[PDB]
């Protein structure tokens, strides 16, 4: 859920109050306190670290783009022609918080960063492969509301094709992509714009004002970290006197994963019939790398004998 | 357990054999094959990555070292005397494999590296703290046998002490340490010293010799990665045609975590009775950092009022 830090601070203050006065020397804060004696706006959250869980179970892809180039040789000699595709697609991510935080119900500003994520995938023959994908992720620790982000990828596939005389070669670019749900831990460090240092530094999560408002006293992170019902997601006191909270996001990513080119040869005088179909030797991944076409089609690799 | 890769390769070869001859073109390998037709010694394991799980549940410490320095002022004036401790201790780790690998029962050579590990700990008042510890870890992917390593740490604690006339101040260094069980995933990449490339590169896990031994054929990682009973710990085929295996270690670490100094004041003419006990303002961590003494003793921090 979205934890309110103002409430928890108020719960901690009201727990320590009658027992040690929150370490404040003197004063009549009238416990329990009302949310007017308090201003938690001085609390800072470190910009969150996003830790993707690395997907392990291979997924099925489907065709998200197909296009064609036509190469013709109506000459007397074998020609060397290059097939060149350049296609921009857009990887899309939408992200909701499962376990987030705010301070006094506030809604913070959506942030956006690049995250490397593991993408295990199933080639067309059912072959199993492993790659990584870099994408833009938007997140908001303060709502469950989905935050969208987008990333532009260009697929550049170029290679030479050997076209015989009076043949037509048709090159078909196919882009395979899928839909992945990546859960990520979301990591933040609770600090403050103000400290009660003096012997060593302690973030002040809130000054506690007297009911008449004349004087005040500081509420230090020490009392928050050692509060016996501090929730499960808060870490212990760091060397810093800061406290780490670890929340959660669930992200959904929709990305092209790999591209192949298929060649189909025809004789220019009957274009109804394929003479010869073959694949480019390499499929191209989202991240630009080249892998063997056997990893993603129904052909197994193959070798002759070696007679020593 | 310790998986033998020679067996699994042999199981894969004997699975594919009758079906496609392991992609080898021609030849009568007599399936099933015996372990003489095969030499898996060409298989390489990438030097393992060790991924520590970050301990979350705070632990109790005990006193692993205590020593004293005695400061005396038998002069007429307040003196400024520095107390200086330099103590070498040794962090010890012992590590056994839960899920490891070898090739044909071989026992590889124990390796040793520095790993940063999370150490949550309970101060003397029951306060909860978070630090990190860098230690040497020895591991062997091929046995369950414990591998020990050791790391030398110096504790340097120096500060000035204010000693009144005709007082004795006794400074007591206390080092608190504990015993932590860190489980770690162990990560390796199966490659080969030999490749059947030719269209793209495939590690050869083993040449398969004819029964008469005249000729042979290569067994490529493709057949291993797509073998329907490949075990659960192997990842899919990487872009590299390598296969990632992820095993496990369980490590036990015994380390000092923090040091404090307590001062006890006496009058030099009765040394049976403490006048005044107080702490150095800071405890010192294993990694050299300084944290407030309140995080690790039974004293809560404290502030006066501020009258605006």
Residue numbers in the entry:
A (entry chain A), B (entry chain A): 2 to 309
Article excerpt on this structure:
Previously, we described the isolation of one such crystal protein, designated Cry51Aa2, with activity towards the hemipteran pests L. hesperus and L. lineolaris. The structure reveals an elongated predominantly β-stranded structure with similarities to other bacterial β pore-forming proteins.
Crystal 1 was used to solve the structure by SeMet multi-wavelength anomalous dispersion (MAD) phasing methods. Recently, the structure of the closely related Cry51Aa1 (1.65 Å) protein was published. Surface-exposed side-chain substitutions in residues engaged in antiparallel β-sheets, as is the case here, should not impact the lateral hydrogen bonds which stabilize the β-sheet, but could impact other processes such as protein oligomerization or pore formation.
